[PDB]
C-alpha cells in the first residue's frame, strides 16, 4: 500500500544483510504501538517456477505463538457456520460480526473466512484487518470453503507455505508483539521448513534471498543461515 513509513525508514540500514536476531531486535522497534501487526518471511527460491516438479509446499509448526492459544475467528455463511463451530474456531460469526468489530472488538488473535463473505470483509474491514496483517485471502490459505479443514490446522499449530509463479513465497511467523527470542525462533522455523522442502534437481542456492516485513513497515533483509 502507499506509504506515508518514511518516518521509519531511517532505522532500517537497506545495505544490509541482518542477522536472524539483529532484525528480531529491529522489527520490535520499530513496529507502530497502536495496532499489532502479522511479522511474514518472504524468500525468493532457487526454483524453476515453471516447472511443476520443483514446486515448495507444506507447512511449518511454528515453536511459538500456535496452537489452542490462538484464537481464531470464522466469518462465514449457512452452513459453514456450523462448520466452522464443530471445527472449534474460538468466535464464529456471518457477515454481521463485521459491526462488532467495527465496534471496537478485537478479542481474536486469526481470521479466517469462507470466499462468500469476503467482498464484505474487505469492504468493512480492509483498513482494519489489512494493517494488522489479519485480512484472509485464498493465497495464504485463509479463505476457503473447507473453514473447518482451515480452522483443523491452525489449531493444530500449522502455517501453510507455496511458492508463487515467480518462485517466491512468504509466510506469517509471529507477531510484532512478540519477544525478540520467539521471533527468531519462528523465523528459524520457517527457513528449516523450507529447507526441509527443498526439491530434488534445484539449482543454484536455494534461499537467494530472505527479508522479515510487515504490512506496513520497511522490510528487513536477513541472512537466513544465522
Given at each position: 500500500?502507499?506509504?506515508?513509513?518514511?518516518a521509519?525508514?531511517?532505522?532500517?540500514?537497506?545495505?544490509?544483510i541482518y542477522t536472524?536476531?539483529?532484525?528480531?531486535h529491529?522489527?520490535?522497534?520499530?513496529?507502530?504501538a497502536?495496532?499489532?501487526?502479522?511479522?511474514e518471511?518472504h524468500?525468493?527460491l532457487?526454483i524453476?517456477?515453471?516447472?511443476?516438479?520443483?514446486?515448495?509446499?507444506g507447512?511449518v509448526?511454528?515453536?511459538?505463538?500456535?496452537?489452542?492459544?490462538?484464537?481464531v475467528?470464522?466469518?462465514?455463511?449457512?452452513?459453514?457456520?456450523?462448520e466452522?463451530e464443530e471445527?472449534?474456531a474460538?468466535?464464529?460469526?456471518?457477515?454481521?460480526?463485521?459491526?462488532?468489530?467495527?465496534?471496537?472488538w478485537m478479542?481474536?488473535?486469526a481470521?479466517?473466512?469462507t470466499?462468500?463473505?469476503?467482498?464484505?470483509?474487505g469492504?468493512?474491514?480492509?483498513?482494519i484487518?489489512?494493517?494488522?496483517?489479519l485480512?484472509?485471502?485464498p493465497?495464504?490459505?485463509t479463505?476457503?470453503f473447507n473453514?473447518?479443514?482451515?480452522?483443523?490446522?491452525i489449531k493444530?499449530?500449522?502455517?501453510?507455505f507455496?511458492?508463487?509463479?515467480?518462485?517466491?513465497?512468504?509466510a506469517?511467523?509471529?507477531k510484532a508483539?512478540?519477544?525478540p527470542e520467539?521471533?527468531?525462533?519462528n523465523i528459524?522455523?520457517?527457513i528449516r521448513?523450507?529447507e526441509?522442502?527443498?526439491?530434488?534437481?534445484?539449482?543454484?542456492?536455494f534461499?537467494?534471498?530472505?527479508?522479515?516485513?510487515?504490512?506496513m513497515?520497511?522490510?528487513?533483509?536477513?541472512?537466513p543461515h544465522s
Open positions: 500500500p502507499k506509504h506515508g513509513y518514511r521509519l525508514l531511517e532505522k532500517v540500514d537497506p545495505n544490509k536472524i536476531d539483529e532484525a528480531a529491529l522489527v520490535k522497534e520499530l513496529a507502530t497502536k495496532f499489532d501487526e502479522t511479522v518471511v524468500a525468493k532457487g524453476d517456477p515453471r516447472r511443476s516438479d520443483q514446486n515448495v509446499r507447512t509448526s511454528l515453536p511459538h505463538g500456535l496452537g489452542k492459544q490462538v484464537r475467528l470464522a466469518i462465514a455463511k449457512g452452513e459453514k457456520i456450523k466452522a471445527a472449534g474460538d468466535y464464529v460469526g456471518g457477515e454481521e460480526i463485521i459491526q462488532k468489530i467495527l465496534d471496537g478479542d481474536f488473535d481470521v479466517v473466512a470466499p462468500d463473505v469476503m467482498g464484505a470483509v469492504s468493512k474491514l480492509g483498513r484487518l489489512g494493517p494488522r496483517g485480512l484472509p485471502n493465497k495464504a490459505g479463505v476457503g473453514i473447518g479443514e482451515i480452522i483443523r490446522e493444530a499449530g500449522r502455517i501453510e507455496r511458492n508463487d509463479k515467480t518462485g517466491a513465497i512468504h506469517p511467523v509471529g508483539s512478540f519477544p520467539k521471533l527468531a525462533d528459524r522455523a520457517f521448513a523450507l526441509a522442502h527443498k526439491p530434488e534437481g534445484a539449482k543454484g542456492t534461499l537467494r534471498s530472505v527479508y522479515v516485513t510487515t504490512a513497515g520497511p522490510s528487513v533483509r536477513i541472512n
